[PDB]
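TEACHING EXERCISE
Course module: macromolecular assemblies
Task: Read the component lines below, then compare them to the predicted structure of the full complex.
Student: A.B.
Group: 4
Components provided:
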Amino acid sequence: TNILNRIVDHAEVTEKTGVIEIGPGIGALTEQLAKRAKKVVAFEIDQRLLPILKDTLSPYENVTVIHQDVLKADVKSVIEEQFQDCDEIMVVANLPYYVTTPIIMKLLEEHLPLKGIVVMLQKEVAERMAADPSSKEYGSLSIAVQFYTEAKTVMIVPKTVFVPQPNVDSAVIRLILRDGPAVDVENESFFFQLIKASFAQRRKTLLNNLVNNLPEGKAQKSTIEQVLEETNIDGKRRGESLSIEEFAALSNGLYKA
Amino acid sequence: KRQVASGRAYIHASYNNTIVTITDPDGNPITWSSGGVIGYKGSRKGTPYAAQLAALDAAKKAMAYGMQSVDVIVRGTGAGREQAIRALQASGLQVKSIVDDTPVPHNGCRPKKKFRKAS
Amino acid sequence: MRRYEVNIVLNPNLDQSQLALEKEIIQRALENYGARVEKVEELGLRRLAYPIAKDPQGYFLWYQVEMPEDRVNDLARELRIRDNVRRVMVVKSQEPFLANA
Amino acid sequence: AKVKATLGEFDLRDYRNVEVLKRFLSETGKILPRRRTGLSAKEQRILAKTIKRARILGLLPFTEKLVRK
Amino acid sequence: PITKEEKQKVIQEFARFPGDTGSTEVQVALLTLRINRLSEHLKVHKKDHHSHRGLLMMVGQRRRLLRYLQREDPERYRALIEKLGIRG
RNA sequence: GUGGGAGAGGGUGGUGGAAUUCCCGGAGUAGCGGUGAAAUGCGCAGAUACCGGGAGGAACGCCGAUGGCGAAGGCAGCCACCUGGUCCACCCGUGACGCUGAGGCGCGAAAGCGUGGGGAGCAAACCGGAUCCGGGUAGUCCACGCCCUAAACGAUGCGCGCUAGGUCUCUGGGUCUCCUGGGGGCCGAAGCUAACGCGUUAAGCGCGCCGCCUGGGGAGUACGGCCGCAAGGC
RNA sequence: AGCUGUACCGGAAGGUGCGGCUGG
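Instructor-supplied answer key:
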């Protein structure tokens, strides 16, 4: 246990700050969290596990319990409901891995006025690590989770806290939601489509990806090659080299042609 | 309606379902049958009981056309082969010849994942 | 300059004229490539184990030739041009190994 | 009993003597194992080749249909 | 393949004396013939890696025999290499 | 050298059907299809079960073995051509011409890349369902170039000599119930090993040459160099 | 069943495709 202290330290939580917890479970997290924040609100789903939670949190009064999932709920509604005087909001969810991946994004495209998230992930998928372009870890997911925020892994964790014994190591990643988009965007839809078209076959050359994966494409060989020429991107360069600024520029190029 | 009076029967006995079809010597089918027409749905369609029923269903819609003599050719490796056989044998019909015609590949196309790991 | 056996399977549904014509066509083709026939045997018509070109019957001819090796393939290519011939098979003539003494 | 014993002298490499070759075939068009045929290693191997040759020529069946229960 | 007649003629055209069949000269000539034929084969058939190993063995073996012949007696070595047209 | 033998060794040029899918006709039709159970999905422009006629792709069922070949990776429908290695008998020829091998050169399962074709089935990623099933792109295939990794293993480098046997099996030769070569396994003398075990196919007794080790983690990581379009490799 | 080379994961206390091994 007691990892909670170090995670909270990396949360930079203050008294003025409020906290949202998505997978509180037994409330051990909430326990050590309570002594640091004025407002803590917990989303909860398990009808079975709720009664045991209700009585255990009796000592601390600053807690709030909400009985619907993050998926089918308006987070902004809760923020306006409870966080009226609070300065900024952190999130310290430690829920099972297979659930965490969509919800983190979902909180991001909606562009809530929340600053950052501190969350537990698998080591390998640490928002695909630092998302430095020339790496294996670099991906479409990375492009998503740096288009909206600045992420870095503060530390990792072997061994176990909750489960008896896992097989893989875990990490903790810390976030700040950025004020605006990284670079000007003509469309979100086209941009995201271009990302998936580039990353559909990672090993294949960028030119092949654009020609094949992107709709039409076969009729626009000359057009695609020309536009990538004015973009100052080499045809044989792979998707894993292009960066955010690059993809922006390429997306701008591809539209209006 | 055909009054061919003598045809051949085909039994496709799969793992999940059993289908029987009667046809003329030419090869134009006159009627069939299936666990589905009986009224059974889901797993029970594969269960031999539905075979015990569609068995004679063939026969009946066949007496309906006035056929007497039958040739039986069976396919597949369903659990309900043999009991379906004894069935359309004692549905009231004179069976001439019964043959197994389960089609096997001569190491051709690659099967499902479920049907790999063969040594 | 080796010895080979040639098996020809052709259409049984022929009269004297057509089948004869086919015989001299095959003979001429075989002769042109510098081959030399030694024995010719004609087993007429034998039931086929399975239909070949939608016919449960065929006419078999057997040739014992000896000729240069390099041309062999070429001959096999030419004997298959006729629509009547159904199967062509050229094999090295090898010694009759006997068992069950 | 084994097939080999209950026969006369014959040729293995002769891919045309059908009435001896069929007796090396099962009710289905399959080559019998060494157990059923009682042949030595080399003669079995050459017999397989002869079977394949005659079988391609159309004298022997690729398969047959067992008539039983 | 090498038929009997040409192989023979190679033996009795390079024989040091009547009935000589095992001298260095005969071995080298036979290897040269085999190498020529096999090299032609590879010139036509590019993607035959297996026979390339045999070719390498042949070249090495012939090289060893020439090395021995040169070490033992020079003039006969030069006569042989001129007669066979080795090394260009 | 002469006379013979076996074999999924390799490359090239072709044809044989079983099966899946699609198309064109016939007849017939209320459901097919799937799991431990179920649900997506296909069908009145009439599906599956069926018959006949075409198209195309990939692989080669019994034989098939504990079997064979190759230096390894690996190699099975059949025929033809070109070609490598190897074994035995004769004991005919040369007279040490041999072994090993740092670098170099070549080969190198699968996965992956480039320039073009092809695409039946299966299937990463991906699209849906109950929370394994139905589809589906790359890929698997061919030609030419790259990539050079592994439980690339017998976890056992190569060559030669000596040291009890028994049994099974593949393939040769003789004076044929046995004798004598070359392979593949199993029990075991002496001996070796920490033990398991090895034991004429040594992990025994020795000689020759090459490669590699110096406690675990950090780590096959960092920097540098070489190779490659890239992933990456040394 | 486990291990392993490789190639991918926007429902990653690991999952799957192509192989390979018994150190099951």
